[PDB]
Amino acid sequence: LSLPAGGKPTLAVANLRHTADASDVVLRWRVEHDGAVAASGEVAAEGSDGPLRAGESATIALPAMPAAPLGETWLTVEAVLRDATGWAPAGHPLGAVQLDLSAPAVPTRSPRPATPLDGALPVSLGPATFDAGTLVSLAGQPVSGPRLELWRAPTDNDRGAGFGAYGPGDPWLNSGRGVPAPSSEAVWKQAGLDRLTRRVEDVAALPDGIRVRTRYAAADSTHSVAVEENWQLDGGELCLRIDITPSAGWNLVWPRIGVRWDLPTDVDGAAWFGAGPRESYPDSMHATMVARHAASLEELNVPYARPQETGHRSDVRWLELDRAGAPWLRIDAEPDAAGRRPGFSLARHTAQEIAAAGHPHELPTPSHSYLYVDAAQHGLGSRACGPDVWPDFALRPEARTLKLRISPA
Amino acid sequence: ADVSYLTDQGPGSGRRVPARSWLHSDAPALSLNGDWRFRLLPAAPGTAGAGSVLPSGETVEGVAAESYDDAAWDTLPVPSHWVMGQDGKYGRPIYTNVQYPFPIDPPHVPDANPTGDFRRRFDVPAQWFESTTAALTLRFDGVESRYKVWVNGQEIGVGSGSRLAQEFDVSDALRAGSNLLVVRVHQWSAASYLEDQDQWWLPGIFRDVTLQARPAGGITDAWLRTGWSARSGAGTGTIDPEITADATAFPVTLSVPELGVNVTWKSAEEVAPLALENVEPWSAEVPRLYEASVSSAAESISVRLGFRTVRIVGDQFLVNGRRVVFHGVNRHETHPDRGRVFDEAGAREDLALMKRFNVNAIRTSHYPPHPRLLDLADEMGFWVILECDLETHGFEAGGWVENPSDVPAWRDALVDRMERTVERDKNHPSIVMWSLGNESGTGSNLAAMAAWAHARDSSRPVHYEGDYTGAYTDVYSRMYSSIPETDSIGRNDSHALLLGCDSAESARQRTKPFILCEYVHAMGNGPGAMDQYEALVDKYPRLHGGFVWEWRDHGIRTRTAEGMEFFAYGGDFGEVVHDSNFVMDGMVLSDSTPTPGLYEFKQIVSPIRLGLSLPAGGKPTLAVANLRHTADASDVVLRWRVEHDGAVAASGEVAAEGSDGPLRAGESATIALPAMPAAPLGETWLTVEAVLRDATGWAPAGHPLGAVQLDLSAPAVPTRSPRPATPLDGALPVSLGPATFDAGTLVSLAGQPVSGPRLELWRAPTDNDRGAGFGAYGPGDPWLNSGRGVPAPSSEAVWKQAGLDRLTRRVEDVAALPDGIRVRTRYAAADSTHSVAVEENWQLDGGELCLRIDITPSAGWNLVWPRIGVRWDLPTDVDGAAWFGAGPRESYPDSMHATMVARHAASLEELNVPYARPQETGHRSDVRWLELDRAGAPWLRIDAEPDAAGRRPGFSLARHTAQEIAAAGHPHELPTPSHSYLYVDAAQHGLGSRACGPDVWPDFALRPEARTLKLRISPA
Amino acid sequence: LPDGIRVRTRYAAADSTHSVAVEENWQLDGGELCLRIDITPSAGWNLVWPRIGVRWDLPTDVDGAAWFGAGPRESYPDSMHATMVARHAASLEELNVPYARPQETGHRSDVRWLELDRAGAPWLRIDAEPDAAGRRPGFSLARHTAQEIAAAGHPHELPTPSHSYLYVDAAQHGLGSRACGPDVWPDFALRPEARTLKLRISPA
Ligand SMILES: [Cl-]
Ligand SMILES: [Cl-]
Ligand SMILES: [Mg+2]
Ligand code: NA
Ligand code: NA
């Protein structure tokens, strides 16, 4: 899909089949405004002489689709089978593509950075309650956090060491076999990434807010990550900026950069606008659409035979957490200076507990639900048997900012 | 008395006022500039190693007291540096590049710590104490380094951040009538660790000291954040105002008369964004400003609005929706008499000179300039990278251990520096990037500066070249990356590792816009490669150009013990540690003379790119491309001329037009010029220049932007050389036309005593010839090892080891020819097994004196040669030359773009460039003929024939040998001339930039070869 | 201090991260002036050191010395065989060798005590106590500093003297023959170490 300067949305179609023409296929399109269908239709897959032949390409101009003045406008086109076969229903999708047609972004105006004040800390800020600067509840429910996390429950590929690692050299050298190296899990454990400790440097009032500065580091390590939270009320909304600024020494792939919130166990589902419906990671984004999505815990997370990282939803505009069936908390996320959006995961156990379990049935009975809001996740690759994560999708140490607005749903 | 303030790592102390803009306000104000009472102490009072620094009976901070008697004290101008303009009375400047001039022991500084006490009386109007005034503010725009302030004996506070503004609240200390201000300034402090810029160390109160009376219900700060997007017609402007003021200030009115805006806000809550139709955008090419004011009943602020929007989209740096290519320079305030003290008239002229050489951007290396400079950049049109005052480069050698950038004790200080940088200058449209500082490694504190800037100002990206892995910056910035590495950065099919990065970090840096924050190091004779870097920018959209290091030489005017004036550099002031002439690394000399390297820059970065060709049977065809960011080419005229052996035969003008009127930015066109038939004899050259039709604030009408030539000459007629002759027995000739010989030795030419020719391989080494940072390019494929070369000594080291500066001449034989003479000689250094054979065949051929010189090296020579040429020793009254060839300025194999083939003429002072350290200069290339003059009167002509390969020689004329020049550290150290020396060079080595940057690119490097000169010599 | 003074100083070159801490304890003990100097280098020093000592700046009329220790001529760790322990005396001219190129010369080793004279008249006496390892200091008396000497190509290029300089060295580097031959044999080469000087200073 493309939008030629001055034109209409233009659909390129290539029939990549070996023999069959595209007569069994119909192309269905929809335009959605913030996830809701505003217009839709369907076109036949035709070439220069009837149905698009095996090995033939064509282009089709679709109807004009003016951008909605506010919010986001997305075009999706899906190739589907017209008729049922012995193995699929009529309307079975073969594959899809999207085109962002959104009107120019209206950035939210963030609160000005504020000088800390002497004096008492606020007890409540909108839906948040604090005890001596420690978050204790959000929107009527007990909640702890945010807590920096770098650890993720290692994937099978994070545990692999057959192929070499791509980090240390040009990946095009050595026949693309990488540089002999320990597994990612081995280096992460050796760095103590699974056992970071939190130390409070200082807590201070802001005008209509609170600033908390913390420093995270593993026992027996010289490396650290400073974290600063600025909670501010801005026009009745609770704004939270979190700046994460690592020390200089860090020289390994990081599994993730995010913060964890500890929630009641009855927080059991989420809705979001962003990539979905399933989990996605930097080198695994093709089967995603930007739309409105919703899932319970069991739909969010894949029950892989060995418990590991699962369930990350990328490129999130907003999420809404459901509790005992009903909407409870809304988090809006603003893109950072580089236009990057965070992701989230919702889990019944911490990444440390998951990493410890050999099978799902070996996990303890849950005491919390955990929300991870991730600025970044490492790619997946296939190093259990095959190439490491391709360098473009590999996470190395970096400073990140999360810009959140938190409200009762 | 507590002197812990001297080593404190915090931002400063006392009655500090929150950082805000430098604003043009009508609030009552007065300047405290003038001649203050001053004394210099050798140490900081009250420190452990300063037990008896003060006069008997004076207490550590007694100087502050209103009762203190300073009647006998000298006075010192404020603003100034105490080490400048005083004949050394209070010490001298100290130059270091990277090394700190004190032990690396943070936060401690030496006991020998020049400390200046300043005392000033001044009057404050009684009116300033009326209820119409809410507060009284004392402002320091610049003090090096840390200082403590007392007013009427009360301690007010301590400042840090030498090039950053600091305001203090003196409301409670001042009185109506006469007041006292005392400032104690230390040269060294904990702040000096944060200020290791490559420049002179210059203590003192070097920017303005002022008082302002803050109006009750005034506006403390405003930020009129502007934006622009394209429409039909002019386009749409936006203002997103931020007003910092008390509730009593409202109503506040924003007025922009030209745009018809007059908006009154009745409370803080009404202050809101506005969109304005028919707004012309601001850019460096077209710096359109709109006058505006923001006022309450009590105070009016005048702003000039430039509407422009900066956006990064993937790897593109856009302003107003179009990619910006930076043709910039690194600049800081510099003056041989005044140091870093600002002078508006001088600054305007400086920026005008930049514009005349096609500079469109300035990086403020490596701290904010005087705030007034930014008004000039807004008005004259430069893209600006405004850089915070931070450089900890000296921590590198010890592996960055204790680097303030990653030490928590310094964090508050570093973030405060960024806050003061951003707040002062946030209103200026010329600023399109904030920079965190320079060469300070990496660390959590640098990332915290970036996080603060991002939180405060989303309108401008964050630049910092020490962020090699791209952990917290929005652009990828490098300094002196080679051509191979820069190519690797710009291209989309390379996963090669970049400096300091693993493969993932290298990939992420390639996702951002790229700039060279420093490149083509301009020190001495050079740089080469500017064309190679520009060709990468042409080729790869990710590459956005760069900033030359640097604009000006920083020479300090001083006198020898005998009273001879000169520009001093590092070490000339008796420094213990110093970095010599590395402070002399500008495109412009200390007296403001543009060097040949600046003319080369100008041509290469011309906004109107010209090409010439002659299609078979067609007419001369001119290709024209408008490479500008926004402006069409209506201001430009294309002037052509054809010259027959240098003399104009025909000329004309052509408009730069595209498909629809004037050639638009980004548009290309071709135009057939008139037919220009070749002269049947001699050479015919077409020159086309792009010139400004009309005058600007900074240039006259007809100011050239760039040029191109095309050779249209008739096929060459090769001259008939005398047949090689067999030598005869018997008497040598004495007289061969204009030459006279004594027993085969030349003694005169055309009535004047002359010696020669003498083979010469030595040249007086350029600063680049003396560099050894990057490796040399000879021993390997230059595209390997990221273009970093092979580690190796400097060219000068290998030349001296080989004895190239001390070749000896041995005559093998001398023989008569029929109407001539043959001389065979052999050249070699003492203790060397290598040699060069030289044969001279002088022959009269139809009454013309022909000289063929064949230079045939032995086999074992394995190093670069500086030159291959012959030297002639002439009378000192030989003092000018005319030639037909490349000119009018010196040129070298990797620096030929700003030359034209034509007839040129120059005296000795015009021929040779007075570089701060004497070195190779003055070579004129591609010479057809040269004529030497004796005080304007033509004396000797030499015609040169091209060799078998079509190569033409060049020449230089000098007052001293290459050997004497090489031995002199400054021009004034050269002896009184006893000869003029003509060097006729078959070859010269290229320039490169190895003093800091790549070696000479291999295509332009001189390696041992045999060469022939074919000359005809006649009286002129 | 009770009947004394303690001075703590730190020595380091510009642009260096290394340093040497020095503590002086001056204490009157039974009418005698005792001075203990403890020299304690930082960790990273990784090169041979020329000497470890202290310099005193004196009037130019201090122009001779008597001592009890090794003599009568200069001696260094790898050049001790022609010394005898005895009472010796020398003028400046007899103390220092005029080598064609001015360099280190004049070090007297294994000193129990030294007396400085002004025109033959004894002025100052310094007694040195052996350190914990039994090591004794040495001394040199010079008309110029080691820096000034290093800078001069010939004796006649030195400036008119403005002081006499006494160096009391805990250690000197050996001599070897590296201008053409083996380096100093390791047994005699000086590497960074902490040293103490224990002195008693009196009028002679
Ligand atoms: Cl913890
Ligand atoms: Cl000779
Ligand atoms: Mg130059
Ligand atoms: Na410096
Ligand atoms: Na420099």
Q: What is the CATH number of the domain that holds B320?
A: 3.20.20.80
Residues in a beta bridge with A289:
A276
Residue B495 to residue A391, Cβ atoms within 8 A: yes
Q: Is A47 on the interface with B (CB under 8 A)?
A: no
Residues B206 and B318 in one domain: no
**Tokens at C60, concatenated:** 């130019």
Stretch (H or E) spanning B902: strand B900-907
As a whole number of angstroms, the distance between CA B453 and CA B446 comes to 11
Owner of token pair 């950069």: A257
Chain B stretch 550-589, residues whose beta carbon is closer than 8 A to a beta carbon of chain C: 576-577
**Tokens at B703, concatenated:** 């100011």
DSSP string, B34-90: EEEEEEEESS-TTSTT-TT-SPTT--TTGGG-TT---TT-EEEEESS-TTSSSTTTT
CA-nearest of C3, C78, C75 to C33 is C3
Q: Is B400 on the interface with C (CB under 8 A)?
A: no
**Tokens at C99, concatenated:** 């080598």
Ligand 5 center from residue B963 Cα (angstroms)? 26
Stretch (H or E) spanning B911: helix B908-911
B115, B41 in Cβ contact below 8 A? yes
Mutate: best of B99, B104, B188, partner C, most C CBs <10 A? B104
Identify the three-state secondary structure at position C141.
strand
B522 marked as part of a ligand binding site: yes
Identify the three-state secondary structure at position A126.
coil
Cα B763 to Cα B893, B895, B921, C173, distances in angstroms: 15, 17, 9, 43
Q: How many CB atoms lie within 10 A of CB A409?
A: 14
As a whole number of angstroms, the distance between CA A68 and CA A77 comes to 18
Q: Omega before A146 cis (within 30°)?
A: yes
Stretch (H or E) spanning B345: helix B344-356
How far does C117 lie from chain B, in Å, by closest CA?
A: 31
Of the partner residues B403, B444, B474, the one whose CB lies closest to the CB of residue A245: B444
**Residue numbers in B near A171 (CB within 8 A):** 495, 503
How far does B429 lie from chain A, in Å, by closest CA?
A: 19
DSSP string, A281-335: BTTB-TT-EEEEEEEEHHHHS---SS--S---B-S-SEEEEEETTEEEEEEEEE-
Cα A320 to Cα A142, A372, A407, distances in angstroms: 17, 13, 10
Residues B560 and B653 in one domain: no
> Which ligand lies nearest to the CA atom of residue B93 in the structure?
4
Residues A184 and A215 in one domain: yes
As a whole number of angstroms, the distance between CA B76 and CA B89 comes to 11
Pairing verdict, β B383-387 and B361-364 = parallel
Tell me the torsion sign for CA atoms C7, C12, C13, C15.
negative
Name, in order, each residue with C-beta under 8 angstroms of A324's C-beta and a sequence gap of 6 or more.
A266, A268
**Residue numbers in C near B401 (CB within 8 A):** 17
C97, C90 in Cβ contact below 8 A? no
DSSP letter, residue B538: H
> Which ligand lies nearest to the CA atom of residue B392 in the structure?
4
Pairing verdict, β B462-463 and A326-334 = unpaired
Residue B576 to residue C19, Cβ atoms within 8 A: no
Residue that finishes a domain, picked among A109, A138, A163: A109
Residue of chain A whose Cα is closest to the Cα of B472: A399
As a whole number of angstroms, the distance between CA B1019 and CA B843 comes to 16
Residues in a beta bridge with A57:
A14
As a whole number of angstroms, the distance between CA B891 and CA B904 comes to 13
**Residue numbers in B near C17 (CB within 8 A):** 103-105, 397-398, 401-402
Residues in a beta bridge with A99:
A75
DSSP letter, residue B582: G
Q: How many CB atoms lie within 10 A of CB A233?
A: 18
Residues B298 and B328 in one domain: no
B149, B31 in Cβ contact below 8 A? no
The tally of domains found in chain C comes to: 1
Ligand 5 center from residue B366 Cα (angstroms)? 12
Q: How was this structure determined?
A: X-ray
Residue among B195, B387, B423, B518 flagged as catalytic: B518
Tell me the torsion sign for CA atoms A52, A57, A60, A66.
positive
Identify the three-state secondary structure at position B213.
strand
As a whole number of angstroms, the distance between CA B884 and CA B904 comes to 6
Residues B512 and B647 in one domain: no
B524 marked as part of a ligand binding site: yes
Q: How many CA atoms lie within 13 A of B439 on its CB side?
A: 18
Residues B880 and B1014 in one domain: yes
**Tokens at B745, concatenated:** 């030795």
The separation between CA A86 and the C-alpha centre of its own chain, rounded to angstroms, equals 37
**Residue numbers in C near B577 (CB within 8 A):** 14-15
**Tokens at B64, concatenated:** 């502050």
Stretch (H or E) spanning B535: helix B530-539
CA-nearest of B981, B518, B501 to B762 is B981
Residue C14 to residue B99, Cβ atoms within 8 A: yes
As a whole number of angstroms, the distance between CA B602 and CA B606 comes to 6
**Tokens at C194, concatenated:** 């902490």
Per-residue burial over B34-52, b = 16 or more CB atoms within 10 Å of its CB, e = otherwise:
eebbbbbbebbbbbeebee
Residues A292 and A152 in one domain: yes
As a whole number of angstroms, the distance between CA A393 and CA A280 comes to 12
As a whole number of angstroms, the distance between CA B966 and CA B957 comes to 16
Q: Is A113 on the interface with B (CB under 8 A)?
A: yes
Q: Residue A15: what residue type?
A: N
Q: Residue B149: what residue type?
A: V
**Tokens at B364, concatenated:** 């403020």
**Tokens at C182, concatenated:** 């083996």
B221, B424 in Cβ contact below 8 A? no
CA-nearest of C81, C103, C102 to C173 is C103
Residue C15 to residue B398, Cβ atoms within 8 A: no
As a whole number of angstroms, the distance between CA B278 and CA B283 comes to 16
> Which ligand lies nearest to the CA atom of residue B830 in the structure?
2
DSSP letter, residue B438: S
Owner of token pair 């105070």: B299
As a whole number of angstroms, the distance between CA B883 and CA B870 comes to 18
As a whole number of angstroms, the distance between CA C190 and CA B129 comes to 71
CA-nearest of A173, A155, A176 to A390 is A176
Chain A stretch 158-217, residues whose beta carbon is closer than 8 A to a beta carbon of chain B: 166-172
**Residue numbers in B near C15 (CB within 8 A):** 96, 99-104, 394, 397, 577
As a whole number of angstroms, the distance between CA B83 and CA B78 comes to 13
How many helices and strands (H and E) does chain A possess? 3, 25
Of the partner residues A169, A241, A399, the one whose CB lies closest to the CB of residue B472: A399
Per-residue burial over B702-719, b = 16 or more CB atoms within 10 Å of its CB, e = otherwise:
eeebbbbbbebbeeeeee
Name, in order, each residue with C-beta under 8 angstroms of B334's C-beta and a sequence gap of 6 or more.
B340, B552, B554
φ and ψ at B904, to 5 degrees? -125, 155
Residue B503 to residue A401, Cβ atoms within 8 A: no
Residue of chain A whose Cα is closest to the Cα of B459: A337
B1007, B993 in Cβ contact below 8 A? no
DSSP letter, residue B594: B
CA-nearest of B744, B747, B894 to B817 is B744
- B842 class by beta-carbon count within 10 Å (0-12 exposed, 13-18 middle, 19+ buried): buried
Number of residues that this document lists for chain A: 409
**Tokens at C100, concatenated:** 């064609």
How far does B198 lie from chain C, in Å, by closest CA?
A: 14
**Residue numbers in B near C13 (CB within 8 A):** 103
B636, B683 in Cβ contact below 8 A? no
Owner of token pair 């001699």: B682
Residue that finishes a domain, picked among A67, A94, A109: A109
- A272 class by beta-carbon count within 10 Å (0-12 exposed, 13-18 middle, 19+ buried): buried
Q: In what order do the strands lie in the sheet with C138-142?
A: C51-58, C164-172, C138-142
Pairing verdict, β B361-364 and B74-78 = unpaired
Q: How many CB atoms lie within 10 A of CB B1000?
A: 28
**Tokens at B308, concatenated:** 């422009």
Query: Rg (Cα) of chain C, in Å, rounded?
Result: 17
Residue among B439, B465, B760, B931 flagged as catalytic: B439
Per-residue burial over A114-142, b = 16 or more CB atoms within 10 Å of its CB, e = otherwise:
bebeeeebbeebbbbbbeebebeebbebe
CA-nearest of A231, A248, A223 to A123 is A231
A11, A62 in Cβ contact below 8 A? yes
As a whole number of angstroms, the distance between CA A357 and CA B567 comes to 75
Ligand 1 center from residue C62 Cα (angstroms)? 69
Residue B406 to residue A247, Cβ atoms within 8 A: yes
Residues B977 and B924 in one domain: yes
Ligand 1 center from residue A352 Cα (angstroms)? 13
B790, B776 in Cβ contact below 8 A? yes
Residue B461 to residue A337, Cβ atoms within 8 A: yes
Residues A170 and A120 in one domain: yes
**Residue numbers in B near C16 (CB within 8 A):** 103-104
Residue of chain C whose Cα is closest to the Cα of B401: C17
How far does B103 lie from chain C, in Å, by closest CA?
A: 4
Residue that finishes a domain, picked among A109, A128, A157: A109
Write A364-369 long-range contacts (CB < 8 A, 24+). A366/A265, A367/A265, A368/A262, A368/A263, A368/A264, A368/A265, A369/A263, A369/A264, A369/A265, A369/A266, A369/A267, A369/A268, A369/A297
> Which ligand lies nearest to the CA atom of residue B101 in the structure?
4
Q: Is A396 on the interface with B (CB under 8 A)?
A: yes
Ligand 3 center from residue B790 Cα (angstroms)? 24
Name, in order, each residue with C-beta under 8 angstroms of B560's C-beta and a sequence gap of 6 or more.
B566, B972
Q: The domain that contains C9 carries what CATH number?
A: 2.70.98.10
Domain that holds residue B670: 606-720
Tell me the torsion sign for CA atoms A111, A113, A118, A123.
positive
**Tokens at B17, concatenated:** 């006022």
- B334 class by beta-carbon count within 10 Å (0-12 exposed, 13-18 middle, 19+ buried): buried
As a whole number of angstroms, the distance between CA A301 and CA B776 comes to 57
Owner of token pair 């002497």: A118
DSSP letter, residue B415: H
**Residue numbers in B near C12 (CB within 8 A):** 103-105
Q: How many CB atoms lie within 10 A of CB B82?
A: 26
Pairing verdict, β B326-331 and B543-548 = parallel
B526 marked as part of a ligand binding site: yes
Pairing verdict, β B755-760 and B867-874 = antiparallel
Residues A46 and A161 in one domain: no
Q: The domain that contains B224 carries what CATH number?
A: 2.60.40.10
Q: Residue A297: what residue type?
A: L
Q: Is B465 a catalytic residue?
A: no
As a whole number of angstroms, the distance between CA A342 and CA C182 comes to 67
As a whole number of angstroms, the distance between CA C188 and CA A383 comes to 58
Ligand 3 center from residue B357 Cα (angstroms)? 14
What is the maximum alpha-carbon separation in chain A?
79
Residue of chain B whose Cα is closest to the Cα of A250: B443
Cα B442 to Cα B386, B456, B506, C17, C161, distances in angstroms: 19, 21, 16, 19, 50
B960, B1020 in Cβ contact below 8 A? no
As a whole number of angstroms, the distance between CA C183 and CA C190 comes to 12
A269, A294 in Cβ contact below 8 A? yes
CB pairs under 8 A between A and B: 99
As a whole number of angstroms, the distance between CA C53 and CA C196 comes to 10
**Residue numbers in C near B104 (CB within 8 A):** 12, 15-17
Ligand 2 center from residue B808 Cα (angstroms)? 4
Q: Is B402 a catalytic residue?
A: no
Q: Is A5 on the interface with B (CB under 8 A)?
A: no
Pairing verdict, β A50-51 and A46-47 = antiparallel
Residues in a beta bridge with B822:
B815, B841
DSSP string, C52-111: EEEEEEE-TTEEEEEEEEEESS--BTTB-TT-EEEEEEEEHHHHS---SS--S---B-S-
DSSP letter, residue A117: B
Owner of token pair 């996963």: B495
As a whole number of angstroms, the distance between CA B317 and CA B541 comes to 10
| Interface chains of chain A (3 or more CB pairs under 8 Å) | B
| Interface chains of chain B (3 or more CB pairs under 8 Å) | A, C
**Tokens at B489, concatenated:** 């950065």
Owner of token pair 């003016």: A66
φ and ψ at B475, to 5 degrees? -120, 155
Pairing verdict, β B219-229 and B684-692 = unpaired
B479, B435 in Cβ contact below 8 A? no
Residues A378 and A356 in one domain: yes
**Tokens at B1011, concatenated:** 């060469």
Residues A105 and A119 in one domain: no
DSSP letter, residue B165: -
As a whole number of angstroms, the distance between CA B776 and CA A125 comes to 63
Identify the three-state secondary structure at position B888.
coil
